[PDB]
Ligand binder design. Structure first.
Ligand code: HEM
Ligand code: HEM
Ligand SMILES: [Cl-]
Ligand SMILES: [Cl-]
Ligand code: NA
Ligand code: NA
Lengths: 713, 713
């Protein structure tokens, strides 16, 4: 069946904005997962998980009689797809159970892990999501094997279809670099937003870069991919060495024995994959990665044996039974237990990427300190495990249950608690009047609030206007934010704030985070008034102001908009066309297509463009809230052509006289070109639509202002 | 970006069930198009359309000063995609304005026609849909040119995204038959459900079959495609000769001058396509099809000149200026006006497919009758034009506005008016109890109601339980409907009906159509009670009983289910896997994936399978409404293998003992295989889900019972 994608493989895809509809969700429209989880008997679920660790099933027998290592790897892979560049991937949506991640080669035999958890899932039902279950099982695995975790939060609601993530352009699983769709260029530079080295891997290749078994060069890949997953050197060494304290790899025979991944398997496989023709196909004969390495002398117990082995032996290159590159300890005795036969022992072995922890000079120093101070190792691994498994959960207000750690961590982008009465409706009216009397213009107020609120992304629930981080480094210096203009607005608003707060009694005060938002609302109200409409814009107080010391400047950098079609902004020239970047931004903002459309058309006429660009400003009454963008965009009286100087800027001329009427970018004109977007533009550009336009605009403005308001959930 | 469809091009596609979400719709949740249309000033719209017909725009000048022919072609193409096999295509959703139809080669330059209508669309806004406007425009064209139409109904609500239709498997536009993805086999047999001869055409190739200019052979393609669009010989001749009374074709120069179709064009083209480098690119220089034929001596006026020319000349094969095969009148004078130069005239010309109407012996008889009796022609054309443009609109109850024809036509599948009081809630209770006391079983009651209601398809809004056509030919003899079993049920129900109606006063009576549905309701309630659960299944009376004489048996044939996964039924062996046919059925029933899942699981355990097959009956308490299908399907204690006899039937055996527990088809086991459907099955298979399962099952049962109830809209 030939599809629209087949005919026009480069037209824009809007289906990403309409995922996760109430249509595909089996739960009712009023289901609230937080409320269900809060009633779960978490202690009961943990008991069951503890029992499961040593209840071996014959269809995938437990190594050493204990599933703990398999489960830790399942949890680490669940979390391990996370990229800081867009916040996509991670454990927070349980996406390991859907395509493509359920069939990524690095996720081989994790299908067995998840199927082992079905009886507990079934027993507790909607009160524990798959997403939370995958992480909780990893924690219980650690605890059962003697490692005290730092804590656990529930609240990851399940999702019901695949997320649309760009995992790369390669058309071959595991393709090495330099191909027609290479994710590398230059001096081993990984393309943004990717955080893994090959299609179908979590982070790096365990044999070494493109399969070359050089621990030093592997270390560079480890550092880069881990930093693109929000982890620094200390955290990276702690996580790899901590994880490889447990369990083993699987490579008992040639890989050619392993059959189709789950999404390719026959219907009789009932959702499992990688069926192996090698001997019994499981247990002692398992093939997962193709490597055959067991790290410690007690693989089912927390120990300090990883760094004792790493440093206590010299290492020789060898091959696994499947032909993969790995390392064996020179002159060692057979001290490592076999997973199934008590009469067999094995020499210590390591992966290339484990040896990175010793032969990279920066890692070596941390590794040595961990070897000499095992309590430092344990603490670091516990903290890092918590961060790994919660990094995509968003503000601490979303954390549920009795095991949430009290300690506030910097990577959580913490917001102080509010400890004073909030402003009421009369106070809001008084503050809006002050803002409008100060001389701040509609353009300035809308631009500033937009800048503050639109850093939110629903992928990891970072960003938004709570915190007033727009006043701090680095947001106050971002080019998209117009630093000089922004400074002048913030000085004015800070003076309003100070004057209001200083006149109060009874502890009442307004945050700058709330005032920025409130001021934007006043601009929208004033713009409606300019167009002859009496409109009230909803506002919810309660934001607090974070400090600079609570704002990690390096972690904030990934939130910088380098493309923001809602302000007609593009920081540089990119290979991806700007309308694709607009839809990507709309997805991160949680906007539907109708919402994106109404929002952009209104922001254009309110003066929200960076630099006051006239691109897309299709009105003679700027700063008035009208549907003029749509009416003028769709006027067949205007003909459009790309300019000679710049093919991504277009001129709109009167068709009869040739006179220049407007200019526009690709983001502006896509609304008059794409057949679905133009159908939406036509509704808002119709003669019966002015009031609809206004009311839909206020709704989506308010939505954006509230995106991070999990304190009101 | 590599997608799941790239990796697993044969996995099942569920996204067709989640189109049309509230996410993609710009109108509010409460928007009701019928209420908007009912207050449209339809007379004022028509006056504006009438003025438009002779108001030429210089960016697409009007032929002969009149856009009427262009607009008739536009309307005919909007309607002309309809296929009776699945009811897909047609004018009823305005899909001409979306991909791919907006860019079908046969739709070339209808982008200009739609653009001409934007000022009118814009003026009347949400009170006239694009879908309705396209048809209305063709009617006003006809009327302005002196043709009396049969009438017009509004009510086609706009849609906001492309429908997923299988248009064929060819990967090249207009590919000739016989290629690697040929839609023909055997002796020129077109594959179901297609109704056109080449990818990107409406019906046939105007040059002749695969370009061979033989009118006799062309006639065969015309008859077959038009029959597959629900038109017979009389209607086919009336429509082709009627349409070609007006306007002209466009082929002024070589086709290589014409550029990209709209979906491929640059963003500056603002939704238009086919831009032509030939001279002025428009008007006198237009190229659309590549043919250059003008049929009559008055192309802007209704006449009987088409048949006067067809029969009053002999015809010679020639070529257009673009090199296409066409025909010219031997020895003729230049009597046809030129479209732009009043000093030029032309000889009469014809397409190959026009000459079919004289050289096919069956068409020739009708064409001669039309020639000698042009009043017969006019009436046939007007009726056929109404049918063409309304054939996918559904029951007459959906027809809106002041020009609906009063005449009831057989093709409407008409439902008699109800002229008596309806049963009330207490009557419904009395009838349910009588049904249950008669000895009819849950299985019989469920199966019969299912059979009656599930003929509905949302593609053309035909079928459903209204009418009680299950008791008539041909439904009563369809194999899926289990004719002998069905006859026994209907006799019992008819006795109940007769007794209840004979005891009433005041004219109150119950239809058999209502009673069939009510009796199914009683079966579902009794199945719930069998499982220990008291529920009331909603029921809405007001169906009426149609007669045999009001039922076209040949038109009803396309509604026969040859595949119905909800009854585990496949009439024969098909190339398309059965799970794909289940999702197709679910789409036609308007079901989401969750709805499909719950419904199937419940039908399995109620005894709804055809023939009482045990396939998928994963319960030891058949006729009790439980979630046993899901609990048993998902139990990892059971291992599944295809049988030796039949690779599409699977045995579920105890994993430890080998004992046979169940048998299943592909339709049953896809719910334990596909990663999205398994996620759904897991919710209903959970230990907390019994209440949920029952409530969702009752809800989707009731939805199916009401699919054709546009009297309650
Ligand atoms: C450079 C990063 C890493 C690389 C290249 C890597 C590589 C791998 C490979 C190849 C296996 C074998 C899979 C198989 O054949 O069964 C594996 C196993 C495992 N990894 Fe890692 N790993 C990395 C980081 C992590 C991290 C951060 C953790 C957890 C904190 C982790 C925990 C585990 C555990 C517990 C196992 C054993 C699984 C079993 O017992 O079944 N590893 N690792
Ligand atoms: C065998 C069936 C048919 C064939 C192969 C066919 C073919 C065509 C072609 C090739 C053109 C010229 C396109 C262009 O170059 O502009 C066209 C024009 C047109 N056809 Fe048909 N047609 C068929 C049936 C119909 C039917 C059923 C109607 C309406 C009742 C219709 C009404 C029109 C009109 C009015 C035009 C003139 C358009 C203009 O003036 O711009 N045709 N036909
Ligand atoms: Cl994701
Ligand atoms: Cl359709
Ligand atoms: Na994420
Ligand atoms: Na249809």
């Amino acid at each position: 069946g030939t599809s629209n994608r087949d005919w026009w493989p480069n037209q824009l895809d809007l289906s990403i904005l309409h995922r996760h509809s109430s249509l595909s969700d089996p739960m009712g429209k009023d289901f609230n997962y937080a409320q269900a989880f809060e009633k779960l008997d978490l202690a009961a679920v943990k008991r069951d998980l503890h029992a499961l660790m040593t209840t071996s099933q014959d269809w995938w027998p437990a190594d050493f009689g204990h599933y703990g290592g398999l489960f830790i790897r399942m949890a680490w892979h669940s979390a391990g797809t996370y990229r800081t560049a867009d916040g996509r991937g991670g454990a927070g949506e349980g996406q390991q159970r859907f395509a493509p991640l359920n069939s990524f080669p690095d996720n081989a035999n994790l299908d067995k892990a998840r199927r082992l958890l079905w009886p507990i899932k079934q027993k507790y039902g909607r009160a524990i999501s798959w997403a939370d279950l995958l992480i909780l099982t990893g924690n219980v695995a650690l605890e059962s094997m003697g490692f005290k975790t730092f804590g656990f939060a529930g609240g990851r609601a399940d999702t019901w279809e695949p997320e649309d993530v760009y995992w790369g352009s390669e058309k071959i699983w595991l393709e090495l670099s330099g191909g027609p769709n290479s994710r590398y260029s230059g001096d081993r530079q990984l393309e943004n937003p990717l955080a893994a080295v090959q299609m179908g891997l979590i982070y790096v290749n365990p044999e070494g870069p493109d399969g070359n078994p050089d621990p030093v060069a592997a270390a560079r890949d480890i550092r880069d991919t881990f930093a693109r997953m929000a982890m620094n050197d200390e955290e990276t060494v702690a996580l790899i060495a901590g994880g490889h304290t447990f369990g083993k790899t699987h490579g008992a025979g040639p890989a050619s024995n392993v059959g189709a991944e789950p999404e390719a398997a026959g219907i009789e496989a009932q959702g499992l994959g990688w069926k192996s023709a090698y001997r019994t196909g499981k247990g002692a004969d398992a093939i997962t990665s193709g490597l055959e390495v067991t790290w410690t002398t007690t693989p089912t117990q927390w120990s300090h044996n990883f760094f004792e082995n790493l440093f206590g032996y010299e290492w020789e290159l060898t091959k696994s039974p499947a032909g993969a590159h790995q390392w064996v300890a020179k002159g060692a005795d057979a001290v490592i237990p076999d997973a199934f036969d008590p009469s067999k022992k094995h020499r210590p072995t390591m992966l290339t990427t484990d040896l990175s922890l010793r032969f990279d000079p920066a890692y070596e120093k941390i590794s040595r300190r961990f070897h000499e101070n095992p309590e430092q190792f344990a603490d670091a691994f516990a903290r890092a495990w918590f961060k790994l498994t919660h990094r995509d959960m968003g503000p601490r207000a979303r954390y549920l249950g009795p095991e949430v750690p009290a300690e506030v961590l910097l990577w959580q982008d913490p917001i102080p608690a509010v400890d004073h009465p909030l402003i009421d409706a009369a106070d809001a009216a008084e503050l809006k009047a002050k803002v409008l009397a100060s001389g701040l213009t509609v353009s300035q107020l809308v631009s500033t609030a937009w800048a503050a609120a639109s850093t939110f992304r629903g992928s990891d629930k970072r960003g938004g206007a709570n915190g007033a981080r727009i006043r701090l480094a680095p947001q106050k210096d971002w080019e998209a934010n117009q630093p000089e203009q922004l400074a002048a607005v913030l000085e004015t608003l800070e003076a309003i704030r100070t004057a209001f707060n200083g006149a109060q009694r009874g502890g009442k005060q307004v945050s700058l985070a709330d005032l920025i938002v409130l001021a934007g609302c006043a601009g929208v109200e004033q713009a409606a008034k300019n167009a002859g409409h009496a409109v009230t814009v909803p506002f919810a107080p309660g934001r607090a102001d974070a400090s600079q010391e609570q704002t990690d400047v390096e972690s904030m950098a990934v939130l910088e908009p380098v493309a923001d079609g809602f302000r007609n902004y593009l920081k540089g020239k990119y290979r991806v066309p700007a309308e694709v970047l607009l839809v990507d931004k709309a997805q991160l903002l949680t906007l539907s297509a109708p919402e994106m459309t109404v929002l952009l058309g209104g922001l254009r006429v309110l003066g929200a463009n960076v630099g006051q660009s006239r691109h897309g400003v299709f009105t003679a009454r700027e700063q008035a809230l009208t549907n003029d963008f749509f009416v003028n965009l769709l006027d067949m009286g205007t003909e459009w052509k790309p300019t000679a100087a710049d093919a991504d800027v277009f001129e709109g001329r009167d068709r009869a006289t040739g006179e220049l009427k407007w200019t526009g970018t690709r983001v502006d004109l896509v609304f008059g070109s794409h057949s679905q977007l133009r159908a939406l533009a036509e509704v808002y550009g119709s003669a019966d639509a002015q009031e609809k336009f206004v009311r839909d605009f206020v709704a989506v403005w308010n939505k954006v202002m509230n995106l991070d308001r999990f304190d009101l959930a």
